[PDB]
Symmetry: C5
Subunit: 350 residues, 5 copies
Amino acid sequence: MPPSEFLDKLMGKVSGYDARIRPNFKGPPVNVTCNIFINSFGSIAETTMDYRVNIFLRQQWNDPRLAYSEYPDDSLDLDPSMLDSIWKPDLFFANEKGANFHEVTTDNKLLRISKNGNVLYSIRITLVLACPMDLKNFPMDVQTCIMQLESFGYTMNDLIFEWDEKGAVQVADGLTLPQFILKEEKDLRYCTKHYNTGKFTCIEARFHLERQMGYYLIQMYIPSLLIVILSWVSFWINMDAAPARVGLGITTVLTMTTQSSGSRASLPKVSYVKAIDIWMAVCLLFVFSALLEYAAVNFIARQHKVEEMRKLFISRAKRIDTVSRVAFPLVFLIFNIFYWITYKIIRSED
Amino acid sequence: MPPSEFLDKLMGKVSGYDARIRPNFKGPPVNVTCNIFINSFGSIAETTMDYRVNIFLRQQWNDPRLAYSEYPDDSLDLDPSMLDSIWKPDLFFANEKGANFHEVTTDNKLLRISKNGNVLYSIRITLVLACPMDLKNFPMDVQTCIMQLESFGYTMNDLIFEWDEKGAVQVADGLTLPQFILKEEKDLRYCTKHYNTGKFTCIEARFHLERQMGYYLIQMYIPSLLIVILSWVSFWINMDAAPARVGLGITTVLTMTTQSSGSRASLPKVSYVKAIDIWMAVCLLFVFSALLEYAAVNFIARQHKVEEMRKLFISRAKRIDTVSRVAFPLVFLIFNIFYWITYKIIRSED
Amino acid sequence: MPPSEFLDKLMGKVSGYDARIRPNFKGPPVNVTCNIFINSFGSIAETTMDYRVNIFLRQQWNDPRLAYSEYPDDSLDLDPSMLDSIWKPDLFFANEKGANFHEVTTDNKLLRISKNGNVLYSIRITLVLACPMDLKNFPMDVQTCIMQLESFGYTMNDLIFEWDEKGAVQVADGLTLPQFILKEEKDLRYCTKHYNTGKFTCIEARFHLERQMGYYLIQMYIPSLLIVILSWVSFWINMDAAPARVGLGITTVLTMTTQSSGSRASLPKVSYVKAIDIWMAVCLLFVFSALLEYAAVNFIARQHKVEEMRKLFISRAKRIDTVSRVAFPLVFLIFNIFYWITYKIIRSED
Amino acid sequence: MPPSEFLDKLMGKVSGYDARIRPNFKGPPVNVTCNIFINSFGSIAETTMDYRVNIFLRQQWNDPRLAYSEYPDDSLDLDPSMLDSIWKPDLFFANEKGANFHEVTTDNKLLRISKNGNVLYSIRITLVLACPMDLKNFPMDVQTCIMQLESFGYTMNDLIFEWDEKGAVQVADGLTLPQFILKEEKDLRYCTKHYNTGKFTCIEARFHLERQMGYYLIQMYIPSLLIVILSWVSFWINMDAAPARVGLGITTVLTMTTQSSGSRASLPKVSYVKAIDIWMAVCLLFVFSALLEYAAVNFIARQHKVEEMRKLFISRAKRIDTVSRVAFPLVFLIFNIFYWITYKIIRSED
Amino acid sequence: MPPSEFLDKLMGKVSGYDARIRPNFKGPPVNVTCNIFINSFGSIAETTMDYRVNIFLRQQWNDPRLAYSEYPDDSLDLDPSMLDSIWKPDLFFANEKGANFHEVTTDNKLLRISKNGNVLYSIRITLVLACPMDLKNFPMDVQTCIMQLESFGYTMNDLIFEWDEKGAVQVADGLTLPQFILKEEKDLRYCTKHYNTGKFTCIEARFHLERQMGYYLIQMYIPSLLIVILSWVSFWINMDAAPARVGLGITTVLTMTTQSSGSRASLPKVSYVKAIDIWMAVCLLFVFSALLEYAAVNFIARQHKVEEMRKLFISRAKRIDTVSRVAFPLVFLIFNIFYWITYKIIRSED
Ligand SMILES: *[C@@H]1O[C@H](CO)[C@@H](O)[C@H](O)[C@H]1NC(C)=O
Ligand SMILES: *[C@@H]1O[C@H](CO)[C@@H](O)[C@H](O)[C@H]1NC(C)=O
Ligand SMILES: *[C@@H]1O[C@H](CO)[C@@H](O)[C@H](O)[C@H]1NC(C)=O
Ligand SMILES: *[C@@H]1O[C@H](CO)[C@@H](O)[C@H](O)[C@H]1NC(C)=O
Ligand SMILES: *[C@@H]1O[C@H](CO)[C@@H](O)[C@H](O)[C@H]1NC(C)=O
């Protein structure tokens, strides 16, 4: 038998196969299993509120027609150039921007057909998908990003979408993200869609992302701690009143302010207050306190600037110094560890 | 009856249905009801003067042809591949940039037809639409953005566009905007269009947006208040003449100026003066006053630098200090609350 | 009579209408009237040297064919789907980048035909057009932007382009630009094109744009004036030699320099010197003078630092102070008003 | 004779003209003359390493077929809608990115045919072309940008490309570039291409660009000179040891550093050292020297701070001052003029 | 024999050549040799994690059909307009974004056919390819970028891809990269692909890139060294306690911090610590030490500020100075050379 003759008999003019009619017309809904392979992941930006993903969609369904039973083999790998004639289920993504195809040299498509009629359709598509991330806790946070596959034009009575029991989602080996660590959980559940026009099927896939704090710690926490320690020692040995003494505080003020402004750049605008803002606010309070104590001791010195009074004022000023000395490391220590442990337990609960 | 035979009889060669002729030719204008569903909203930028929206257009009209009365069911869900043969009303948007279609796997289209001839056309389109926002009051403002649907090629005698009496505009559940809060009002009115060529139908939909001031307050108001308070206390204990005393003022000057420059970055250029500019101007006036009073007390000290004269100059200088002390918090307090209450009442009127 | 039968008789196979032949072949040139409507304007950027415009092109010409005289009405509104068969005049823009079409739901096109043969073609196109603006005077300037319509493929003997006597250019009501004010003058003149291949027709439309200086004044002139006044008073009460006195000058130097650098950011690079540069240069000269006078009085004090000599040096130093006092406001006043009046008269002449 | 009948006889089914066969098959190579007109030029960016150009390609060749000799006129201006049937020579650009066509209203194309068979093909194309500029001397430099036209698919035995003897390259009148001045030289030479597959024809066009230094001088040279002069005078009158004296140097240090960082922004990264870097380095050396001399005189003063020794130390310190005084202007003068004259002669040689 | 008649006999209707069937059907897999020519390279950005490349793909395979043996010559250069009829092997790239074709004037394609049936297919394509660079050592690093060619739709039994024994990869003469130096090694190995659907052939090409450190050294190392030396000398002659002395340290602090922030701008965010960070950290430690020693000597002076005690405190303070003097150059010298030699040996091993 020649291949061409059979090939036109299967889906051509002698065949009564109209490509505008669903298989099993006036019958039970056509069940469709969907298997997705993630070729690549990444390019997630906080401002844009979306990520980039390259998938290999694969969907299988059954047809009562296109059952040959004439060649001795089980399956046939057909050309992807008559895919227009074969009926194709509609499938679009709800949180989707763009989503072009790939056409390098030839269109990237795959067609297979078995003896019973089970087909295999494979399409490569790069999707920009919108993820509504919540930045309540900026340095440490778990982000859930949603992929939705749903039927635009058919009701419940047709095109029921089902997941695959085994190996529903696969990932490429040695695939890494610079910023996040992917979690191998990938919980799958499906939520149907209700509209005034009708009720439409949908299936959902969920991915969990964990950020890496190493960059954040080196970029912000480590310099800020250095500034705090520097300020502490600078006043600790500072003596009486000198214009030079003021310089140590002045440098810290400006540098801390610039760092604070710099940190709130990449992130988009949100009403709620992030954790990094809290850390910046407390460090600003500490540096603001530094000036305060100086003003205080200067006021005591001003009152001092008779012999009977001098001893008490000089003593009171020194008392202010030693009390500042013991107080400043202690309250920062009891606060930062409290901050870290409370964030440590919230991530553990999440 | 086979589905294919009926399907070609309805809109094919045996049918006298020419797709270039409007239904009810030489007759009353074809009425069209339009229902819009907002799939997603967002990506509004002040500079660009436009926003991004993903809608689900739905338009219904009646045809005297395409009335089958042969299958026992009421409606038929047809394929979206013969939509070219069906006559389609022209519809374009006036404040429109771009507005591509979506073609993921298959074109996103929907076709339905009832027994009487009422059709249902559904198209997914992402529109970039221009909104002429007025920034007279920057931190608090209500913005109205306009969507216009109008007929490019037909006159009044044809293609009259009407709204839908019930559920004209729907919104997706759990849809949020990072910057703005959408108001559930959505007032609908229609304005016809007049041209030299003729008079063309149009319908309009209006959306109200309310900005969230939480980001603005934390970003700008809170640091500026801190700078003002710091400056106040800094001079409050400042004593006589020392080069060190000057430092407190110097830091504030530069930091305030940098913040003022930084704030006017995101916004585009406009002739009128924004509220934030007013707040920045008054704070700059306060810090400018700080230097002034110093210069004054230094001039009194310069005159002082004989015994009879010294008491009066020293007293006058101290008088200047205490008067500065009582005056500075009081006038800022009576001004900021006045500013807030006047803006509070203008938003209430708006 | 059926509409379809007439519709194919007019421009089909029974008709000898070849769409590759110009009307009035071997005859006088085909005159074409062009009417343009500006749907929207804006998005002008100085660096890119171009603007964005959305027009409604409309062109009318006569054909000896397509004269029906069979239906009792005067005109017919045809579908825009047989516009390919109708002969269309070539028309392109010389200072053009891009210029895509609009295809939302359906192509935006319009076809009309009268009894005599006068047709009406309407096309919506968004054009990015290059405007060679001259920035000799930056804050105040009038910019002329050119739109050119010309025939790519035909000579003088064919396709003569003429303007419309009445209402050649219309503008949408309530159309505004954030930066510029449009002038309702719109002078129209036409310049033919000469090439080695031949002579080609062209028509030109000119628009005048006037910038709004309110943003510029608030952004730059008002802070710079404040810095100048501050500097003036700061030295005015400055006494003898103190390291603190220097601070007043130091702050001004840096802030003025940063503002000067900031101002020359948006503008692209040009050889000639802008007006804003002149204003920045004079203010820099004033602040530079401030340091000078200080150095001078310090040199007199250094010579002073015997009793007979002290009186003359102290007097000379005070003389320098009072002379500085009277001189500094006077020369700035006689210069700034001179600057403003000369620019006021140049705009009036322009 | 009707135009349509002749028009289909020339390139249709009765004609044996196959559009897949080169003219003069099994014969001498088809010679092609190429004339280029530069409609616009500009948009050159140093980082991207490419420029934007809008050309009017024009190529002429001879065909033995398509020789009519039946109409009494010499040439015919055909429609650009049967250009697909006419055989067209392949032509692509080697240093090419993008290069789309223009389709405003109608495709921009031109067809002409003479009695002998000489055709004229005109195509409008905007090309982004890569120019490998060498930035050895940044402020003054001559840049050569290359345009290459070559045959992708044919060997030497076919499609020989020749230039045009007269008026090979034309430029539009009144065409200017904001940054560069075009030179009216435009030397043309051709270099053939060798590959493993075969030898392919190519022709090359060269353009020379001269930068304008006016922006660079005002932006960088003039402020830097002002800073140098200021520093010079500031120390020149500086007296003994005062903390205030230090301020004059401190301001210069920071401002010079910021300017130095600012200048190296637009330019991309290169291994070799630019001229502007040299100028920045020498000015940094001068300001660095300023601090040095201060440290020296302070060390002499420190040793001074017995009567016999005081006279010699005070004298030595004053000697250091006067020597600094004479030395500093002289060495800057003998260096800057040397720098300018050596660059003046290198541009003259180039 | 006419060329047209043979041309349609080879791949037309009289020929039984179906373009949907692979050559050697039901036979051994079709071997394909692939030769790639790199027309241009460059535009590599660290953030995007990808590079731009313009290649000339060339693939050869054998067909049992299309064996003419009728013209006396060996090969024929066909038109690229019947390339659709010829069967073409599928080929796509795995680490691929975009990859459009080039269509300037005509499509860039090449067709050749020999007497035996060996064909030659040439396609020009610009590919954006993702390179997973590792920035463990930023200033000096070798980067490997991967190109993968693989068969989308066929299994092992068909379309085996083989490399070319001689001249597999060629590069254009005089091709340079501004940032990197290409290594003439280009090791080629192939790795097959395993999927649930089946096993698919692939081949890989590897390129090695070496960065040039000249820009980095001038941009960062040279200024930082200057700051370190300046700081060293500044304290080296600094005397006792003066507010002026503090200035030398203050300037360094701010400038070093700004440089440190500036350096970490171009690079994207990564968890691990780069070499440049280490160098910045050590320089920050040195400048931080500068303040420390000052505080120490000031504390000794404070204790000093009775005659018996004064000699020991003054001596101890001077001892601190001389010890600082000998210590500071020595430890920087023993550290920087150690840093350079360890990086020198790691690059040599790599
Ligand atoms: C799809 O599956 C459901 C439940 O398993 C079944 O009731 C229905 O008949 C199936 N439809 C088919 C096989 O077309
Ligand atoms: C549309 O509605 C108007 C007013 O209800 C009516 O006069 C007109 O006949 C309608 N046109 C139709 C039904 O085609
Ligand atoms: C166009 O107008 C000119 C001048 O009015 C006239 O000479 C010419 O015949 C006209 N061409 C037509 C009507 O085709
Ligand atoms: C092209 O020119 C060359 C040299 O002038 C000549 O030998 C060749 O025959 C020409 N080819 C033609 C006219 O086809
Ligand atoms: C391809 O090469 C392999 C090994 O050289 C060989 O076994 C196979 O038959 C070849 N396939 C062909 C020539 O189609």
